Amino acid sequence: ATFEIVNRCSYTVWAAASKGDAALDAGGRQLNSGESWTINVEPGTNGGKIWARTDCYFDDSGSGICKTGDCGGLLRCKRFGRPPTTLAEFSLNQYGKDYIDISNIKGFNVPMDFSPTTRGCRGVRCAADIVGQCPAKLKAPGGGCNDACTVFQTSEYCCTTGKCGPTEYSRFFKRLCPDAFSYVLDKPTTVTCPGSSNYRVTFCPTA
Structure with a gap:
C-alpha cells in the first residue's frame, strides 16, 4: 500500500511511521511546510501508526529529541512515540479489508485528516483546536x-481491567473530535475500506 504523508501546517513536522517493533518504510522524515512524503507499507501490516513530531533537533547521525512524539530519540522511528500524539492507525488486508481510524487515546498534538486516495470508503478527520482548548491538567509543556x-x-x-467508562477528560476530546x-x-469510529486501498495523511488539513 502507498501512503502519501503531507504537511499542510505552517511549521515543520517530523513524520513517523511504525508498527511498534519495526519502522514502516524509512520510519521518519522531516517535512517542511507543504512537503509530501510517499511511503510503501507492506500488505498485511497489522497495527501500523503514523504521527507527527514537533520541535525536533537531530544530529547528523539521526539522533536527538522531539517535544512531542519522540520515539527513543531517533529520526527514523522503530517504536511508537511519546504522548501527546494524534494517531493515524491502520491494519491492512485483514480478511479482505483494510481498517483505518484516528485516535486521541494517546493525546493530541497536530490536527490530522486520514483519507483513502482510492475508492470505496470515506476518510476521517480531527482538526479542532484541541491544544488551545485543552483542560489545564492535561496541557503538555512541550506542546500538545x-x-x-x-x-x-x-x-x-487507562481501562486496565477492561471495564471503564467515558470520563470528563475523554468527553472533552470526543466533543471536539467525534470521529x-x-x-x-x-x-468504534473505525472505517472499513477495500483491502489494498491507498491513503493520504494530511497534517493541518484546514490551515
Whole structure:
C-alpha cells in the first residue's frame, strides 16, 4: 500500500511511521511546510501508526529529541512515540479489508485528516483546536494535550481491567473530535475500506 504523508501546517513536522517493533518504510522524515512524503507499507501490516513530531533537533547521525512524539530519540522511528500524539492507525488486508481510524487515546498534538486516495470508503478527520482548548491538567509543556491515562495513570483512564467508562477528560476530546477514539472502549469510529486501498495523511488539513 502507498501512503502519501503531507504537511499542510505552517511549521515543520517530523513524520513517523511504525508498527511498534519495526519502522514502516524509512520510519521518519522531516517535512517542511507543504512537503509530501510517499511511503510503501507492506500488505498485511497489522497495527501500523503514523504521527507527527514537533520541535525536533537531530544530529547528523539521526539522533536527538522531539517535544512531542519522540520515539527513543531517533529520526527514523522503530517504536511508537511519546504522548501527546494524534494517531493515524491502520491494519491492512485483514480478511479482505483494510481498517483505518484516528485516535486521541494517546493525546493530541497536530490536527490530522486520514483519507483513502482510492475508492470505496470515506476518510476521517480531527482538526479542532484541541491544544488551545485543552483542560489545564492535561496541557503538555512541550506542546500538545495529553490523554488522562498518560497524566494520571489510573485503572479508569487507562481501562486496565477492561471495564471503564467515558470520563470528563475523554468527553472533552470526543466533543471536539467525534470521529476519533477518545478512550479505549469508545464506540468504534473505525472505517472499513477495500483491502489494498491507498491513503493520504494530511497534517493541518484546514490551515
